[PDB]
Amino acid sequence: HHHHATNLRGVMAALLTPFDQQQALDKASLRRLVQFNIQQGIDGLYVGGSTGEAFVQSLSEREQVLEIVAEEAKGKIKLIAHVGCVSTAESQQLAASAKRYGFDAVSAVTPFYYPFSFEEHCDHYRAIIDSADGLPMVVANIPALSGVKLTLDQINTLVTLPGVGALKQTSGDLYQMEQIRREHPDLVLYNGYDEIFASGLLAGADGGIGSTYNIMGWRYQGIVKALKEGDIQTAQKLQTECNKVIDLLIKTGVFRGLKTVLHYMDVVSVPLCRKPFGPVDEKYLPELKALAQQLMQE
Amino acid sequence: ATNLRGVMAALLTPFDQQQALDKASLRRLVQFNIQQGIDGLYVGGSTGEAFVQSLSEREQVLEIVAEEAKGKIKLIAHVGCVSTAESQQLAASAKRYGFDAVSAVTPFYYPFSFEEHCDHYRAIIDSADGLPMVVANIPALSGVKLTLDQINTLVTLPGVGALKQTSGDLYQMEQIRREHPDLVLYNGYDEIFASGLLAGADGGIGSTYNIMGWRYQGIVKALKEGDIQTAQKLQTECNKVIDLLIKTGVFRGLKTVLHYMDVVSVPLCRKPFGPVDEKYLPELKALAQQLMQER
Amino acid sequence: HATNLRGVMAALLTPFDQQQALDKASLRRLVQFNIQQGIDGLYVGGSTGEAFVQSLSEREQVLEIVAEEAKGKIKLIAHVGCVSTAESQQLAASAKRYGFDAVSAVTPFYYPFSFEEHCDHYRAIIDSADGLPMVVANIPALSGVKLTLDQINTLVTLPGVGALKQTSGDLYQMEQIRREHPDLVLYNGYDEIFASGLLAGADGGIGSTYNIMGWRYQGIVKALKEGDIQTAQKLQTECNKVIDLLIKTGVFRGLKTVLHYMDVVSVPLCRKPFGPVDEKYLPELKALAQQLMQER
Amino acid sequence: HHHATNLRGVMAALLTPFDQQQALDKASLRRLVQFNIQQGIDGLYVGGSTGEAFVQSLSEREQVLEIVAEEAKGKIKLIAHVGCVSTAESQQLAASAKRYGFDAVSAVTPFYYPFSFEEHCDHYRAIIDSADGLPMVVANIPALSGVKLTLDQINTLVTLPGVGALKQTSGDLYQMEQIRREHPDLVLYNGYDEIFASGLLAGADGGIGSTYNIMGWRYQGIVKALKEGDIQTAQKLQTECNKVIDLLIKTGVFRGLKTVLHYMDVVSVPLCRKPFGPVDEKYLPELKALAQQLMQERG
Numbered sequence A: 001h002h003h004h005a006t007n008l009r010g011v012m013a014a015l016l017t018p019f020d021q022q023q024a025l026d027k028a029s030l031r032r033l034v035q036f037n038i039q040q041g042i043d044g045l046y047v048g049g050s051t052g053e054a055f056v057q058s059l060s061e062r063e064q065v066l067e068i069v070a071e072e073a074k075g076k077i078k079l080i081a082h083v084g085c086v087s088t089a090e091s092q093q094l095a096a097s098a099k100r101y102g103f104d105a106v107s108a109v110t111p112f113y114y115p116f117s118f119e120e121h122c123d124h125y126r127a128i129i130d131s132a133d134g135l136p137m138v139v140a141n142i143p144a145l146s147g148v149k150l151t152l153d154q155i156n157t158l159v160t161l162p163g164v165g166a167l168k169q170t171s172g173d174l175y176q177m178e179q180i181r182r183e184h185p186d187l188v189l190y191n192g193y194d195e196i197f198a199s200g201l202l203a204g205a206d207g208g209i210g211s212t213y214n215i216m217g218w219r220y221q222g223i224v225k226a227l228k229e230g231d232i233q234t235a236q237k238l239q240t241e242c243n244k245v246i247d248l249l250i251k252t253g254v255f256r257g258l259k260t261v262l263h264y265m266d267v268v269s270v271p272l273c274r275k276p277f278g279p280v281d282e283k284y285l286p287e288l289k290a291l292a293q294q295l296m297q298e
Numbered sequence B: 001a002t003n004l005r006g007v008m009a010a011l012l013t014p015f016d017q018q019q020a021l022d023k024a025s026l027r028r029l030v031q032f033n034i035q036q037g038i039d040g041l042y043v044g045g046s047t048g049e050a051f052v053q054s055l056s057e058r059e060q061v062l063e064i065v066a067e068e069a070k071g072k073i074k075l076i077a078h079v080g081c082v083s084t085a086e087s088q089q090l091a092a093s094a095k096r097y098g099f100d101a102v103s104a105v106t107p108f109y110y111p112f113s114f115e116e117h118c119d120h121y122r123a124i125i126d127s128a129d130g131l132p133m134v135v136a137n138i139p140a141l142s143g144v145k146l147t148l149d150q151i152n153t154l155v156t157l158p159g160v161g162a163l164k165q166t167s168g169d170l171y172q173m174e175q176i177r178r179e180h181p182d183l184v185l186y187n188g189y190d191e192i193f194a195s196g197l198l199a200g201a202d203g204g205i206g207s208t209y210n211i212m213g214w215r216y217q218g219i220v221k222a223l224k225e226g227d228i229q230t231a232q233k234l235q236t237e238c239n240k241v242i243d244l245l246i247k248t249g250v251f252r253g254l255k256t257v258l259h260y261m262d263v264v265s266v267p268l269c270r271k272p273f274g275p276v277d278e279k280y281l282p283e284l285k286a287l288a289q290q291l292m293q294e295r
Numbered sequence C: 001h002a003t004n005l006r007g008v009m010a011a012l013l014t015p016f017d018q019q020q021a022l023d024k025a026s027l028r029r030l031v032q033f034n035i036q037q038g039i040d041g042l043y044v045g046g047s048t049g050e051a052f053v054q055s056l057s058e059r060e061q062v063l064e065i066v067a068e069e070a071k072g073k074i075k076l077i078a079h080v081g082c083v084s085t086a087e088s089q090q091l092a093a094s095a096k097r098y099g100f101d102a103v104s105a106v107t108p109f110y111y112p113f114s115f116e117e118h119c120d121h122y123r124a125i126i127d128s129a130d131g132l133p134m135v136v137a138n139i140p141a142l143s144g145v146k147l148t149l150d151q152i153n154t155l156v157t158l159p160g161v162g163a164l165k166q167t168s169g170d171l172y173q174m175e176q177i178r179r180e181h182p183d184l185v186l187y188n189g190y191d192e193i194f195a196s197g198l199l200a201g202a203d204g205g206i207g208s209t210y211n212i213m214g215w216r217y218q219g220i221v222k223a224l225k226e227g228d229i230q231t232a233q234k235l236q237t238e239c240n241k242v243i244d245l246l247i248k249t250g251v252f253r254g255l256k257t258v259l260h261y262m263d264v265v266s267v268p269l270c271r272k273p274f275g276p277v278d279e280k281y282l283p284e285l286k287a288l289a290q291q292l293m294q295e296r
Numbered sequence D: 001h002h003h004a005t006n007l008r009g010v011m012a013a014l015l016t017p018f019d020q021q022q023a024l025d026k027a028s029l030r031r032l033v034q035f036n037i038q039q040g041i042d043g044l045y046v047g048g049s050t051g052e053a054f055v056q057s058l059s060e061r062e063q064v065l066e067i068v069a070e071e072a073k074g075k076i077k078l079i080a081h082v083g084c085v086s087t088a089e090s091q092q093l094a095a096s097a098k099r100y101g102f103d104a105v106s107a108v109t110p111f112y113y114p115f116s117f118e119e120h121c122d123h124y125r126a127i128i129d130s131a132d133g134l135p136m137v138v139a140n141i142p143a144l145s146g147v148k149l150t151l152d153q154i155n156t157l158v159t160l161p162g163v164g165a166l167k168q169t170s171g172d173l174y175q176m177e178q179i180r181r182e183h184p185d186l187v188l189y190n191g192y193d194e195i196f197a198s199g200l201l202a203g204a205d206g207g208i209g210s211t212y213n214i215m216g217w218r219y220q221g222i223v224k225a226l227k228e229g230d231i232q233t234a235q236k237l238q239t240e241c242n243k244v245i246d247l248l249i250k251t252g253v254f255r256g257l258k259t260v261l262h263y264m265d266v267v268s269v270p271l272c273r274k275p276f277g278p279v280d281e282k283y284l285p286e287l288k289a290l291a292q293q294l295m296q297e298r299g
């Protein structure tokens, strides 16, 4: 039974990490972006994730973000720390830091690059969980970036590791999504792919964690509500609108396209991702500007 | 191709004990499908085992289904072969037997360029002589890895009137619907039917519809009426069944269920497919019984 | 004692005509052309031979004709493989009637089959060939089937399997297979690695390009046996120079066009849905033919 | 590529040994370095995937670069693998190795996030800048990184200013030959040990590898075999190398090699960093034997 992490369910923005033209942490843009999310009406933030550019950061720089975010939002919203690295030891330290700063849960993407066994994946989550010292874990499953494809049985076994009470399921397999839900009726189950949120909710996901929620996170809230109320037509209406914007972001690069729109909304000073992520192309700037305006009026 | 919209059963081809066509079980299976209230039949598809059948065999199934159901339901003829000329031969015959549409899976095995693929479909469309084309995108089988730009061009070929989308990618499903608002769009994976309609499918084609096409019609109804709980419940019960069938092999597992339901005389597929494993038989009867209660 | 199937064996092309019917006259030529090249034998009606865009009957008339032109002069393997066991079984007995030396089959495709189902498919075709050695044909790029080494080891140990056509690029596996089966007849399937495939432990080859330059591939076998490495590397690199162009052209229609300017194949068409050769490639394929004729 | 000919040869992928608490076992690193020079290795590839880079901080990687300079400068060629995901991090590692006097720097194509090809080019370019004269060895490792380069993409990367070499860890020997035929003077390392001979036949003029840490001499033995034109010997060695690689694949390659390195008492603790677990129990018999076999035939 997963009633232990039931408080973690809902729509949660995957926190982008702001930087300057020196490629340093921009801490005033982080604060600005957190508060911006809080006032959109988000249920929480997922910090230092892929969307967070965690794998172009030092542990120190991840800790500094963790610390600021908690200072800004602890007790206002649910806060989840993505602590995952390839190394178990690196992931434990981050997991220790998140605890110190008063996060509500820790999370880790399956460790990547080297092909570790399933046994070696489970020991890893147990290690972080223990270092989390009371914080429940969100298993992050994002096969398209990690190259770790997990089966149902494997997943099943991970989300019943003691101390686990949630799954970031960034997978387009909406059959697997239903099986997870049918099998784990209590489990907090984060639809992971913004562009399928509605369908994912329908298949048994009870919220999400996504990149695009930083710039229109109320639209996703509307989807949850519209389907709890039997208004499929508005849920569809909202998903379509979300996906015209995801279409744009895909063309421009997702995280830096998001950053750019946050720049025009007066939230982020410098809309750059860390190298080797290049700059957005100037030809999308008119469409990212127009989008910044559409979304502020809404 | 407006009136092609709906829940269409991907018809299984029955075989006798010596692995020839079973004409009797077949006719039984078609009527059994009409009973359940299906909107139409996709004849001689992947589920149909067309790729372990001769052209004349595929034509024999085709003529016989039209005879059982023409007028009563919509009938789509999967005429797809690796060869353009073979494919054309089945298109010409669907025409003759009075079929409503033809369909075709992307030619497989040999890498064919997108240009050649496009040409494949224009030939078959001309040989189908006014019968609208159903494009079948079934990458898990064919290995053809089609994009949106590619799909967009296929579905907007003159003659093309519908897409069978056997893809799990419900972003692309929503994407296709938005570019082509008039397109007949068939969710192809039973096991996401509800989620697929939600993303923009307007009907479906499926193998498991042969044994519970009413549950799919129930998911179209419940969604239509804002009835969210019921659809999810109805999708869930389908997935408990597909769970099993995946353990048993979808095609022969369906066939057995229909064996226990009095429609199919011998529940075998064509070699290289093997028998259903005997440990599973009880649950397939259990499921036969339970589904026979239901309707 | 199937060790007499060892050799360089051209994956025969199946000529069609203007209207896509078989071109039996150009086919008989191509058989006799191949016999001139000093080829050890022919692999008939494989993937190179556009098997799967032909009817069983067309495939049967090709096999017959080859057996008319070549039986007892070279070796002859008949590719009889289909998705259907029963249809593959029609083709093997037919291959047995025409006096072929061997049958072959690619892993049945399109539908996934369990590995148990594959062995039975092989087991059954073997019964229908009635004593002809079976060449199991592993071609992942086209078939989509992904055999493991234990699964390959199991397949070559089935009663009646004499050989393996290993169209993989994985030459760790090529070596592993040799090590498990020192007397296995092991054909290299990718022509663009032939020499390196021999070094890993193939003892011959099967390939589409042997149709136009098989003697180079016999040049390579000799070279290696001579211990001459520069020659073996030059020949391989020369084959890869041609293969580079055949992939720009599309290899099968490329080969038919080289043979068409070698005035051997009457019309250079593969069956639809394949298209003809991009018009703007003709000068190269022309020169390469002139080139290759001057060479032989 | 002329400018880098001196980098041709058989280079061991240096492992990074750790003590019972997973720290840099500094004395063991020093021993392995000398063991490789005492094998007759042409050079050392340091801080790579076999070197367990991505379970280490920049600090620890710099320490290993630092120590290996001490042991190996002026004795054998030294290549530092400086690659990270973040460019700025790789650039730090690249200046370090220039400061320590390495002969060349190397980076595997940045991974996890899917970067466009321009973004890969710029990254080598900016890592090159920091290496300030040191040649760049581009490292193509699809199995691990998940980055699949087309032939033209490889051709563009190996002719970026300052690139002299390519670690081609890919069993596609057609491509190997195309790479050779397209750049006759490029230093082309065969990355997959299980196909060294065939790799060297297709156009590779050397190698970088993990198993070389326990049997380099066989791989050099293969080079000579093929220079002489004795395919019989080339084949025999390649076969023996693959019998061991067969075993290491079963055990875990990097942990396998660290375990044989224990039984030559070259390495103190044979562990890899978590989430690499320990080698299984049933495999310790074969590896001991293997160590003893490898010492006995060494002399």
Ligand SMILES: CC(=O)N[C@H](C=O)[C@@H](O)[C@H](O)[C@H](O)CO
Pocket (backbone or CB within 6 Å): C011, C047, C048, C139, C141, C142, C167, C188, C189, C190, C191, C192, C206, C207, C208, C209, C243, C251
């Ligand atoms: C066509 C194919 O998949 N394989 C052929 C037979 O093995 C090869 O010989 C290729 O035709 C040739 O090597 C080009 O890749």
